[PDB]
Design a protein around this motif. Structure first.
Motif, mmCIF file in Angstrom:
data_model
loop_
_atom_site.group_PDB
_atom_site.id
_atom_site.type_symbol
_atom_site.label_atom_id
_atom_site.label_comp_id
_atom_site.label_asym_id
_atom_site.label_seq_id
_atom_site.Cartn_x
_atom_site.Cartn_y
_atom_site.Cartn_z
ATOM 1 N N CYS A 21 0.824 -1.204 0.000
ATOM 2 C CA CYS A 21 0.000 0.000 0.000
ATOM 3 C C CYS A 21 0.860 1.257 0.000
ATOM 4 O O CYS A 21 0.544 2.234 -0.691
ATOM 5 N N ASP A 22 1.951 1.254 0.771
ATOM 6 C CA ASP A 22 2.844 2.407 0.792
ATOM 7 C C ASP A 22 3.512 2.610 -0.562
ATOM 8 O O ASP A 22 3.707 3.748 -1.004
ATOM 9 N N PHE A 23 3.864 1.515 -1.240
ATOM 10 C CA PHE A 23 4.459 1.628 -2.568
ATOM 11 C C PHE A 23 3.484 2.254 -3.557
ATOM 12 O O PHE A 23 3.866 3.121 -4.352
ATOM 13 N N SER A 24 2.217 1.836 -3.515
ATOM 14 C CA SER A 24 1.219 2.420 -4.405
ATOM 15 C C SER A 24 0.966 3.884 -4.068
ATOM 16 O O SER A 24 0.793 4.714 -4.968
ATOM 17 N N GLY A 25 0.942 4.220 -2.776
ATOM 18 C CA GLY A 25 0.760 5.609 -2.389
ATOM 19 C C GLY A 25 1.913 6.492 -2.829
ATOM 20 O O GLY A 25 1.713 7.651 -3.201
ATOM 21 N N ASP A 26 3.135 5.957 -2.791
ATOM 22 C CA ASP A 26 4.288 6.723 -3.251
ATOM 23 C C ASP A 26 4.298 6.847 -4.770
ATOM 24 O O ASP A 26 4.679 7.892 -5.310
ATOM 25 N N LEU A 27 3.883 5.792 -5.476
ATOM 26 C CA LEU A 27 3.827 5.845 -6.931
ATOM 27 C C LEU A 27 2.705 6.743 -7.434
ATOM 28 O O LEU A 27 2.798 7.263 -8.551
ATOM 29 N N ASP A 28 1.650 6.932 -6.642
ATOM 30 C CA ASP A 28 0.577 7.827 -7.055
ATOM 31 C C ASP A 28 1.020 9.284 -7.151
ATOM 32 O O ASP A 28 0.426 10.022 -7.957
ATOM 33 N N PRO A 29 2.018 9.754 -6.390
ATOM 34 C CA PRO A 29 2.483 11.143 -6.460
ATOM 35 C C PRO A 29 3.532 11.354 -7.548
ATOM 36 O O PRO A 29 3.398 10.775 -8.627
ATOM 37 N N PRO A 30 2.753 13.446 -10.881
ATOM 38 C CA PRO A 30 1.748 13.497 -9.815
ATOM 39 C C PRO A 30 0.322 13.503 -10.357
ATOM 40 O O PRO A 30 -0.544 14.163 -9.781
ATOM 41 N N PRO A 31 0.084 12.780 -11.452
ATOM 42 C CA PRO A 31 -1.270 12.733 -12.022
ATOM 43 C C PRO A 31 -2.260 12.031 -11.107
ATOM 44 O O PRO A 31 -3.358 12.542 -10.860
ATOM 45 N N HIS A 32 -1.880 10.853 -10.604
ATOM 46 C CA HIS A 32 -2.766 10.108 -9.714
ATOM 47 C C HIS A 32 -3.019 10.861 -8.414
ATOM 48 O O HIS A 32 -4.153 10.882 -7.924
ATOM 49 N N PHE A 33 -1.987 11.484 -7.847
ATOM 50 C CA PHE A 33 -2.189 12.293 -6.650
ATOM 51 C C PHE A 33 -3.076 13.502 -6.914
ATOM 52 O O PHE A 33 -3.951 13.788 -6.077
ATOM 53 N N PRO A 34 -2.918 14.239 -8.018
ATOM 54 C CA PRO A 34 -3.858 15.340 -8.280
ATOM 55 C C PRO A 34 -5.275 14.855 -8.523
ATOM 56 O O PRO A 34 -6.231 15.513 -8.092
ATOM 57 N N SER A 35 -5.438 13.714 -9.197
ATOM 58 C CA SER A 35 -6.774 13.159 -9.393
ATOM 59 C C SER A 35 -7.412 12.782 -8.060
ATOM 60 O O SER A 35 -8.597 13.051 -7.833
ATOM 61 N N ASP B 234 10.873 -7.913 -8.528
ATOM 62 C CA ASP B 234 11.414 -6.947 -9.479
ATOM 63 C C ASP B 234 10.418 -6.657 -10.595
ATOM 64 O O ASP B 234 10.264 -5.504 -11.017
ATOM 65 N N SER B 235 9.727 -7.691 -11.083
ATOM 66 C CA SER B 235 8.718 -7.484 -12.115
ATOM 67 C C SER B 235 7.561 -6.637 -11.603
ATOM 68 O O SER B 235 7.067 -5.761 -12.322
ATOM 69 N N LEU B 236 7.122 -6.875 -10.365
ATOM 70 C CA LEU B 236 6.058 -6.062 -9.784
ATOM 71 C C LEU B 236 6.498 -4.614 -9.606
ATOM 72 O O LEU B 236 5.720 -3.690 -9.869
ATOM 73 N N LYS B 237 7.740 -4.399 -9.166
ATOM 74 C CA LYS B 237 8.253 -3.040 -9.023
ATOM 75 C C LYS B 237 8.315 -2.335 -10.373
ATOM 76 O O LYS B 237 7.950 -1.160 -10.491
ATOM 77 N N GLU B 238 8.770 -3.045 -11.409
ATOM 78 C CA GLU B 238 8.820 -2.454 -12.742
ATOM 79 C C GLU B 238 7.425 -2.136 -13.267
ATOM 80 O O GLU B 238 7.222 -1.090 -13.894
ATOM 81 N N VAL B 239 6.454 -3.016 -13.014
ATOM 82 C CA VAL B 239 5.087 -2.763 -13.462
ATOM 83 C C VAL B 239 4.501 -1.560 -12.736
ATOM 84 O O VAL B 239 3.785 -0.744 -13.330
ATOM 85 N N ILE B 240 4.796 -1.427 -11.439
ATOM 86 C CA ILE B 240 4.293 -0.288 -10.677
ATOM 87 C C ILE B 240 4.961 1.003 -11.126
ATOM 88 O O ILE B 240 4.340 2.073 -11.107
ATOM 89 N N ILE B 241 6.228 0.932 -11.536
ATOM 90 C CA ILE B 241 6.918 2.131 -11.997
ATOM 91 C C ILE B 241 6.470 2.516 -13.402
ATOM 92 O O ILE B 241 6.492 3.700 -13.760
ATOM 93 N N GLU B 242 6.061 1.544 -14.217
ATOM 94 C CA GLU B 242 5.614 1.826 -15.577
ATOM 95 C C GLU B 242 4.165 2.308 -15.601
ATOM 96 O O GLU B 242 3.880 3.412 -16.076
ATOM 97 N N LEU B 243 3.244 1.492 -15.095
ATOM 98 C CA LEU B 243 1.822 1.833 -15.055
ATOM 99 C C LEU B 243 1.442 2.075 -13.599
ATOM 100 O O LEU B 243 1.017 1.165 -12.885
ATOM 101 N N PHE B 244 1.598 3.320 -13.157
ATOM 102 C CA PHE B 244 1.279 3.691 -11.784
ATOM 103 C C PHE B 244 -0.229 3.759 -11.568
ATOM 104 O O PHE B 244 -0.846 2.795 -11.114
#
Lengths: 41, 939
Positions: A21-35, B234-244
């Motif tokens: 969950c923290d990884f997704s929250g960090d990746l959201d910030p910034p199109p997803h965070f503004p949305s 690593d694949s999950l991290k790459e997928v999260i970095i590509e399609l956030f």
């Protein structure tokens, strides 16, 4: 008759009214965070 | 520690064997360091410092040095109580520098692990130098690695220490080169690489190529079992970095899918895990409907691939009607399967039910007839346990007689039958089925649905009478030997109370729960083996029911407070037991949870805290709860953990003293605790729970202000030196201080606190957008004078300017967070909204990022208000900005051109604003000439 009983209501009193969950929250910030900010506002 | 060391030195000054002297020292250091020799701590420190020089002189010689090192390790083990962490780190660095060498490292691996454990225990000494040692160890273990087993453990320990404390590109490149040149064993290196990638500030700028190279090297050569988990991570991290690149990522995904298909009981579980990894990665990356259909059309591996494709797609999306009809035809064909491996069949049925529930993807055609026929054919042979629940879920999803008769026959299971009845609920036969089925709100919902008929009360009365007879028959064993029977009777009594109202309470048993509580208290007082087992069982049963329900639960709690004689007796018994047990970071939590007695005491304390929270006999329990503060204040590691668990859990009158003293007591332990452990999160929850009713008109306001000042000093020390974990606590504290009260409580410089929070956010950029949005939301609801909003806008502008004033990418990323925060503040405010809009339109020259995000800005504006109203508001804001620019010719024309470029229009459609600007400035034929050039007939 059961549709009225199955209706979702509010929570209980203050004892229960309050409620990777923290990884997704960090990746959201910034199109997803503004949305998300626009959806919350 | 002093006299024994001096005697050992006087004996072994000749350095002959140093055996008898070392033995005499180890024997005599006990009492001399126990009572007094000379400041026992400093004495042991000086003894270790002298032993270091003694070992150096003895080594100044391979077998003798190894024997001396073994003797020193034995002495350190006998001296398990350590001190002088700096001296220990210096000795470890000296041993690492001294390092024949391979055997020496293999022997000193034990001391290295001991030092790593000591560091993980006492990192509160602010070492800040473990990163250099970890880098040196990784460099030494890089060329030949000096090992194939111990090097991996050392690298993992170094990575864990670095992650706990707070370049990496060279280490990642060396690891990728090693994995490409040789095998990929010792997956600890891959784990450390993944941890470094997910450590902090992951932008995937340069790490993307390294990850792609590592993935390619692991795909070409590979001999390892645990490396699959690292590859999936690593694949999950790459997928999260590509399609956030995108093509390289697609090629790698295709190669991984081909390898998984080629690889295709324990093998069944391994294939299921590999599928749950690969299909999830593919759904996160991705078009894939054609590949899924081809894999389904292309038999244990085929069935596993089909079950993977079905659940993955069902959890992912509701893809095109072509794939939907293909899956429907496939399910209709497989409906006549051999039913082998019922788990996969149930998974496929659940996936088909989820797809039928999410069927709103195509036009509503008559394709549902085939699904209904398949459901009927499955119900014709649904004499199963999991298949029956799957068919019931499918029928409920399709709906969202024959079915009613089947449901009644099935009810005449515990969870499955209840779910089927709830789905069917969305006469005489129905009453008979309910009675046969009867012979934490799910029970209350079922009781309400059963009583919704408003009739057949005689059946319920007979069922309650039959249950009381069975309860009285089983009480003979429940009071003597049976322990779970008491919990079952308590659950039955709670379920009956969930359905003044003392009639049914006195009718059903009127004594079962009280007798069970009395027996549990008697067993706890006896304190035997089986007694403690039954006490743990009763504590689990009590922790099972801890919350407060609706009016039904309120009536149940009222009946409990009425019959609470035995409840208070058991509470006093549990308090006495907890007192007797007391009298006798992550590591401390694990040590506290590893003890069964400590876990039972914690469960009893949690039950008592839940009872106290429900209360905040029954009425007499208030005095006991108030007197409990004295026991809590009177109540090293286990005691601190119990006190923290108690503090983590009207009452404000006694709280203004209880929590006031508890906060001061927590600071004394927080003196050494002050290391940024997970305990900071538990402390903010306790602070928020205590701050529910604060700033009263009593003398406790001084203690509350003192606690707030202590918290502010702690936050200042954190801002001076802390980690990113304290950012959430600081944001929560700022929000609490903002939402507490008026300037009376905001007298602690709320503006300066918000400025410092914004500065820390711009500096660290951990979840900075969330903190900025929270600060903006807190400022907007409290804004009532129109001056605080302008002050906050000026502070945000200054923070954005400071953030704006290699590192260019980081600066541009930080500027985007500031732009998003300004946009959120504008969407929140009304007049500060237009103010910030004009400010952004003026600063648009260096705000190319804002000019790009103007698309999402206009999208949010159109979602908030209508299009014509947003256009009118934008025209008004542009007129105001032009007036401001004229007040403080060329700049006004540039701003107008920027506004026209942001919009969709030429130098026209603004006749009113142009006439206003002309009457303002000229009262200038140049503006008239420009207007005539932009549009004819302007005279």
């Amino acid at each position: 008759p059961e549709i009225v009983v199955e209706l979702l209501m509010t929570l209980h009193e203050p004892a229960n009214s309050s409620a990777l969950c923290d990884f997704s929250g960090d990746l959201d910030p910034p199109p997803h965070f503004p949305s998300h900010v626009i959806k919350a506002t | 520690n002093d006299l024994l060391i001096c005697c050992r030195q006087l004996e072994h000054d000749r350095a002959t064997e140093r055996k008898k002297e070392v033995e005499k020292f180890k024997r005599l250091i006990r009492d001399p360091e126990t009572i007094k020799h000379l400041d026992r701590h400093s004495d042991s420190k000086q003894g270790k410092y002298l032993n270091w020089d003694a070992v150096f002189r003895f080594l100044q010689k391979k077998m003798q040095e190894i024997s001396s090192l073994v003797k020193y390790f034995i002495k350190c083990a006998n001296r398990r109580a350590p001190r002088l962490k700096c001296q220990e780190l210096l000795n470890y660095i000296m041993d690492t520098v001294k390092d024949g060498a391979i055997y020496g490292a293999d022997c000193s691996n034990i001391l290295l692990k001991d030092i790593l454990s000591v560091r993980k225990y006492w990192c509160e000494i602010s070492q800040q130098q473990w990163l250099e040692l970890f880098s040196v160890y990784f460099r030494l273990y890089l060329k030949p690695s000096q090992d194939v087993h111990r090097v991996l453990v050392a690298r993992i320990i170094h990575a864990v220490t670095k992650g706990c404390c707070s370049n990496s590109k060279f280490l990642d490149f060396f690891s990728k080169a090693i994995q490409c040149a040789r095998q990929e064993k010792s997956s600890s290196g891959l784990n450390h690489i993944l941890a470094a990638l997910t450590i902090f500030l992951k932008t995937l700028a340069v790490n993307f190529r390294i990850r792609v190279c590592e993935l390619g090297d692991e795909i070409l050569p590979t001999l390892l079992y645990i490396w699959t988990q690292h590859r999936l991570n690593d694949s999950l991290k790459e997928v999260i970095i590509e399609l956030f690149s995108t093509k390289w990522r697609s090629i790698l995904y295709n190669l991984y899918d081909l390898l998984v298909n080629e690889i295709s009981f324990r093998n069944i579980a391994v294939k299921e895990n590999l599928i749950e990894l690969m299909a999830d990665i593919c759904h996160q990356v991705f078009p894939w409907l054609q590949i899924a259909t081809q894999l389904i059309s292309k038999l244990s591996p085929l069935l596993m691939i089909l079950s993977q494709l079905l659940p993955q797609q069902r959890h992912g999306e509701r893809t095109p009607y072509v794939l939907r009809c293909l899956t429907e035809v496939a399910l209709c064909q497989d409906k006549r399967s051999n039913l082998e491996s019922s788990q996969k069949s149930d998974l496929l049925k659940l996936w088909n039910k989820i797809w039928c529930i999410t069927f709103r993807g195509i036009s509503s055609e008559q394709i549902q007839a085939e699904n209904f026929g398949l459901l009927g054919a499955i119900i014709q042979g649904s004499l199963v346990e999991v298949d029956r629940e799957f068919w019931k879920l499918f029928t409920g999803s399709a709906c969202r007689a024959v079915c009613c008769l089947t449901l009644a026959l099935t009810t005449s299971v515990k969870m499955g039958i209840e779910q089927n009845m709830c789905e069917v609920n969305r006469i005489m036969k129905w009453l008979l089925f309910y009675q046969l089925e009867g012979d934490f709100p799910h029970l209350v919902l079922e009781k309400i649905l059963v009583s919704l008929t408003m009739k057949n009360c005689k059946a319920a009365m007979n069922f309650f009478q039959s249950v009381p007879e069975c309860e009285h028959h089983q009480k003979d064993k429940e009071e003597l030997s049976f322990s779970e029977v008491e919990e079952l009777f308590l659950q039955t009594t709670f379920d009956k109370m969930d359905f003044f109202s003392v009639h049914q309470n006195l009718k059903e048993s009127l004594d079962r729960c009280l007798l069970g509580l009395s027996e549990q208290l008697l067993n706890n007082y006896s304190s035997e083996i089986t007694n403690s087992e039954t006490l743990v069982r009763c504590s689990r049963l009590l922790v099972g029911v801890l919350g407060c329900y609706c009016y039904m639960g309120v009536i149940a709690e009222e009946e409990a407070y009425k019959s609470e004689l035995f409840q208070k007796a058991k509470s006093l018994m549990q308090c006495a037991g907890e007192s007797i047990t007391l009298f006798k970071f992550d590591r401390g939590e694990v040590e506290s949870m590893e003890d069964d007695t400590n876990g039972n005491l914690m469960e009893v304390e949690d039950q008592s805290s839940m009872n106290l929270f429900n209360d905040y006999p029954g009425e007499s329990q208030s005095t006991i709860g108030a007197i409990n503060p004295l026991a809590e204040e009177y109540l090293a590691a286990d005691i601190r953990r119990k006190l923290l668990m108690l503090i983590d859990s009207p009452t404000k009158s006694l709280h203004l003293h209880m929590y006031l003293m508890l906060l001061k007591e927590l600071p004394g332990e927080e003196y050494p605790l002050p290391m940024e452990d997970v305990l900071e999160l538990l402390k903010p929850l306790s602070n928020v729970c205590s701050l529910y009713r604060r700033d009263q008109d009593v003398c406790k306001t001084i203690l509350n202000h003192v606690l707030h000042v202590v918290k502010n000093l702690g936050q200042s020390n954190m801002d001076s030196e802390n980690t990113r974990d304290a950012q959430g606590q600081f944001l929560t504290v700022i929000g609490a201080f903002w939402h507490l009260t008026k300037e009376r409580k905001y007298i602690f410089s709320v503006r300066m606190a918000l400025v410092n929070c914004l500065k820390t956010l711009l500096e660290a950029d951990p979840y900075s957008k969330w903190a900025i949005l929270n600060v903006m939301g807190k400022d907007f609801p409290v804004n009532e004078v129109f001056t605080q909003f302008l002050a906050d806008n000026h502070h945000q502008v200054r923070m954005l300017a400071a953030e704006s004033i290699g590192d260019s990418s980081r600066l541009l990323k930080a500027l985007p967070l500031k732009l998003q925060q300004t946009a959120f503040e504008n969407a929140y405010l009304k007049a500060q909204e237009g103010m910030r809009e004009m400010s952004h339109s003026a600063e648009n020259p260096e705000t190319l990022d804002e000019i790009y995000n103007r698309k999402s800005v206009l999208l949010t504006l159109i979602a908030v208000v209508l299009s014509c109203s947003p256009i009118c508001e934008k025209q008004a804001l542009f007129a105001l900005c032009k007036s401001v620019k004229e007040n403080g010719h060329l700049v006004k024309k540039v701003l107008e051109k920027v506004s026209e470029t942001f919009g969709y229009r030429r130098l026209e459609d603004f006749m009113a604003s142009h006439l206003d600007y002309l009457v303002l400035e000229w009262l200038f034929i140049l503006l008239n000439y420009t207007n005539i050039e932009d549009f004819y007939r302007s005279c």
